Short mmCIF file of C-alpha atoms and ligand atoms in Angstrom, two decimals:
data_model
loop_
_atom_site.label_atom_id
_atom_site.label_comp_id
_atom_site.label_asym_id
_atom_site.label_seq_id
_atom_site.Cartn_x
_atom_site.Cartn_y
_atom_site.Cartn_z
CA UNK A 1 20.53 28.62 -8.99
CA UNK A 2 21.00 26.81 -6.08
CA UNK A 3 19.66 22.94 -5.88
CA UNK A 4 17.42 21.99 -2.20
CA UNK A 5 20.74 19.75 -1.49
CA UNK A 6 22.72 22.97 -1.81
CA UNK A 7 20.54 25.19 0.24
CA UNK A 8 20.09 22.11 3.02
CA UNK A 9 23.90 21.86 3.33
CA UNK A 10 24.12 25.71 3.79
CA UNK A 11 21.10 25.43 6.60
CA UNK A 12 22.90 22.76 8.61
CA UNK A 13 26.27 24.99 8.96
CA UNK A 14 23.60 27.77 10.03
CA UNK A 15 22.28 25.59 12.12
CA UNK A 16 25.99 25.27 14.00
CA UNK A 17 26.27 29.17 14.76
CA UNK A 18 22.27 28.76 16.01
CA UNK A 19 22.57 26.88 19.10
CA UNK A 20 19.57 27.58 21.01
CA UNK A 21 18.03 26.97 17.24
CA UNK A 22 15.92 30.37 17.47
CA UNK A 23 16.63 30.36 13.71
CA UNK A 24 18.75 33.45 13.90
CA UNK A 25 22.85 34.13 14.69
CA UNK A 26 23.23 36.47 17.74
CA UNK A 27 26.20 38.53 18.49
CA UNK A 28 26.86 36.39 21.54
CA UNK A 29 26.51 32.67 19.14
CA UNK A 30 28.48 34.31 16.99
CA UNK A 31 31.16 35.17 19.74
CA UNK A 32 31.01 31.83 21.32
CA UNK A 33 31.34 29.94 17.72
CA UNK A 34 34.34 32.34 16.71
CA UNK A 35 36.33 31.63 19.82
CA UNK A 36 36.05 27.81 19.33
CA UNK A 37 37.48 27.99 16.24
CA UNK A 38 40.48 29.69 17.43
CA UNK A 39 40.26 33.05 16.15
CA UNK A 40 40.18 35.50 18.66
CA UNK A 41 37.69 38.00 18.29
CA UNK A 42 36.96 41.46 19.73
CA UNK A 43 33.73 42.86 20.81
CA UNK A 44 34.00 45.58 18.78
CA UNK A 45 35.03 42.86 15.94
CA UNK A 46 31.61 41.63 16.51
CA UNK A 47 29.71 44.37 16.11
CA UNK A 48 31.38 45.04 12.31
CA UNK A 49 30.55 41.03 11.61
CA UNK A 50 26.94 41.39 12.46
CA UNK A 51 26.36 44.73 11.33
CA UNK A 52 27.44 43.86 8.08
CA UNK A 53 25.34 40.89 7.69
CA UNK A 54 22.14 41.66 8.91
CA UNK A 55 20.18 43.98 6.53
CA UNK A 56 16.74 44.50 8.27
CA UNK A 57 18.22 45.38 11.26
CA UNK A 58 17.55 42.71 14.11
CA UNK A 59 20.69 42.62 15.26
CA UNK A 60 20.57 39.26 13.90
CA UNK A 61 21.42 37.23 11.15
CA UNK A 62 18.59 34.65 9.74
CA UNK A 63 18.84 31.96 7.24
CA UNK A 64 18.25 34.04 4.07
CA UNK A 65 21.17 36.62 5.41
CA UNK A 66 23.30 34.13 6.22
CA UNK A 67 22.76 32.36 2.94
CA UNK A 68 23.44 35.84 0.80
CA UNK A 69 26.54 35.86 2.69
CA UNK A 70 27.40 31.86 1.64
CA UNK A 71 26.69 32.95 -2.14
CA UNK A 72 28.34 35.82 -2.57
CA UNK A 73 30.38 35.97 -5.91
CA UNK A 74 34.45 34.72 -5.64
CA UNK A 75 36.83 34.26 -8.07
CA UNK A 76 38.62 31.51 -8.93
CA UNK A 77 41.58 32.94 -6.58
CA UNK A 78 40.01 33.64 -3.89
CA UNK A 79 37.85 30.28 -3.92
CA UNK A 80 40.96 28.18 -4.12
CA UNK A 81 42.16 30.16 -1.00
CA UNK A 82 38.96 30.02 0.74
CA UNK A 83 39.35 26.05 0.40
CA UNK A 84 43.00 26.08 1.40
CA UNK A 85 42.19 28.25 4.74
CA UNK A 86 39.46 25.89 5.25
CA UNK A 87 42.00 22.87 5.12
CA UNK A 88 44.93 25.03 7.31
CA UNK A 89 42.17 25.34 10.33
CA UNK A 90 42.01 21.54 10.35
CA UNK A 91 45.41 20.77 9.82
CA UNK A 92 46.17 21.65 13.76
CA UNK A 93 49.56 19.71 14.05
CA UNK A 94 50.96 20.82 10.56
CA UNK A 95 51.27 17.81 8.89
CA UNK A 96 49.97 18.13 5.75
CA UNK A 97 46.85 15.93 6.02
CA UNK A 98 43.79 15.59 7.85
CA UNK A 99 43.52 13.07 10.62
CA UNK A 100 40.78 11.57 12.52
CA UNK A 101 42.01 13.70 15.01
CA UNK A 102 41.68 16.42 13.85
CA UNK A 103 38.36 16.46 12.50
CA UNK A 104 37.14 15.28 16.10
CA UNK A 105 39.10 18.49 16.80
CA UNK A 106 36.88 20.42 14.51
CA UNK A 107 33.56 18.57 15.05
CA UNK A 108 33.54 19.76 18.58
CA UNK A 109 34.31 23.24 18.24
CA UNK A 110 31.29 23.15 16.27
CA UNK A 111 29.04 21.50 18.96
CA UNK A 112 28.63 18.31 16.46
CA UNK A 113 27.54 15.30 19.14
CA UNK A 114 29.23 12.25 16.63
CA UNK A 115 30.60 9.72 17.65
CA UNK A 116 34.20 8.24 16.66
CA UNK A 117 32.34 5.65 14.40
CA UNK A 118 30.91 8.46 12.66
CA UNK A 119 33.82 10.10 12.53
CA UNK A 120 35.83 7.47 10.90
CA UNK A 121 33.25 6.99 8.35
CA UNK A 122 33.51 10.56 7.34
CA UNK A 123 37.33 9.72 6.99
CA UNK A 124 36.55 6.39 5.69
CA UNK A 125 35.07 8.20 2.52
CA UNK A 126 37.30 10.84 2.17
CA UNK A 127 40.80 9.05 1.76
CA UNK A 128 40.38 7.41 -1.59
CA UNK A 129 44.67 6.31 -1.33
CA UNK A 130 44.03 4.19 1.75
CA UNK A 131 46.51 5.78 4.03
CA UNK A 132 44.15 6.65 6.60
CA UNK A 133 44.19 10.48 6.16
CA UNK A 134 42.83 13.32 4.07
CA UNK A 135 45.69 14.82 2.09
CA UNK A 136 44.71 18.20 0.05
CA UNK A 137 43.53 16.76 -3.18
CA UNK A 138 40.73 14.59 -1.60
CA UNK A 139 40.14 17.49 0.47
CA UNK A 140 39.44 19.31 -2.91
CA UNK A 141 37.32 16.21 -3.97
CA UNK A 142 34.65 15.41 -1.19
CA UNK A 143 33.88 19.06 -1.18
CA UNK A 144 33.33 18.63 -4.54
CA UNK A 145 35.62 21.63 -5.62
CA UNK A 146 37.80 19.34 -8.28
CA UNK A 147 38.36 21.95 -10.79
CA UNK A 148 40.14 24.54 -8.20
CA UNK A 149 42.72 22.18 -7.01
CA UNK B 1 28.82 13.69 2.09
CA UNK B 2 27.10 16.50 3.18
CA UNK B 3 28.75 16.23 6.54
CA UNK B 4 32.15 16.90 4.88
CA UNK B 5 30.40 20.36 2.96
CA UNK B 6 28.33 20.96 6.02
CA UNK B 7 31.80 21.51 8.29
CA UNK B 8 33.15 23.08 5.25
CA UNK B 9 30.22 25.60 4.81
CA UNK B 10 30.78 26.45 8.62
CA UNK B 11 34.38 27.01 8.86
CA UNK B 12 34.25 29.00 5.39
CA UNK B 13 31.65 31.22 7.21
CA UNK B 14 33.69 31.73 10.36
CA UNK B 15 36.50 32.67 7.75
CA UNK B 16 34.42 35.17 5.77
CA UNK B 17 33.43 36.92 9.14
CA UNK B 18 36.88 37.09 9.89
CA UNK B 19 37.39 38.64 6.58
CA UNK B 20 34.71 41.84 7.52
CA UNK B 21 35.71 42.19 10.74
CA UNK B 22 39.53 43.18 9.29
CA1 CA C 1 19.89 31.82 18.04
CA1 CA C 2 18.33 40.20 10.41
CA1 CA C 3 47.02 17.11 10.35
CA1 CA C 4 44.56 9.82 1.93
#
């Protein structure tokens, strides 16, 4: 049972596909958000994605779709992973950590307006051994996923 | 805080879409 903090957190990463904040995912957000992250997706690619999501058929994916889909059971294994993939998409220059760097990266892929005070502050909080990074562990940490690493 | 799980949440999701498409 998810808490209101839980559900809020998923809304705001909907809210980062949902750009023209109609309060669904098209296929053509979905493209656009995709490609900024650096995978390369097909249009036939797509098509599977939303298809697959969407089960009153809109063509669309709303909140409550989009939230199934951020719920969905995973192991242990696979959770670890998930976290670990998660870290590898930062980690842009291979180096182990996460810099302020790349999180602006990553922040404006997204279409996040912040500004490099607020992006310190969100590595600020994460470092924990002072060296101005975000190594794995406190990766694990701020997301709050202690247990898997 | 939640800005850390927020970009997390996201970039899991683009992962998981990934994931169905393949
Ligand atoms: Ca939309
Ligand atoms: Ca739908
Ligand atoms: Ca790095
Ligand atoms: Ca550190």
């Amino acid at each position: 049972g998810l808490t209101e903090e839980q559900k809020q957190e998923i809304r705001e990463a909907f809210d980062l596909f949902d750009t023209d904040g109609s309060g669904t995912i098209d296929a053509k957000e979905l493209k656009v958000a995709m490609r900024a992250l650096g995978f390369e997706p097909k249009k036939e690619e797509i098509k599977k994605m939303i298809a697959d999501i969407d089960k009153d058929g809109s063509g669309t994916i709303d909140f409550e779709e989009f939230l199934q889909m951020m719920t969905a059971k995973m192991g242990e294994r696979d959770s670890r992973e998930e976290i670990m993939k998660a870290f590898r998409l930062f980690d842009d220059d291979e180096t182990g950590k996460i810099s302020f760097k790349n999180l602006k990266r990553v922040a404006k892929e997204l279409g996040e307006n912040m500004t490099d005070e607020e992006l310190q502050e969100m590595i600020d909080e994460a470092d924990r051994d002072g060296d101005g990074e975000v190594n794995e562990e406190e990766f694990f940490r701020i997301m709050k996923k202690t247990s898997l690493f | 805080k939640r800005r850390w799980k927020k970009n997390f949440i996201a970039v899991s999701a683009a992962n998981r879409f990934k994931k169905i498409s393949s």
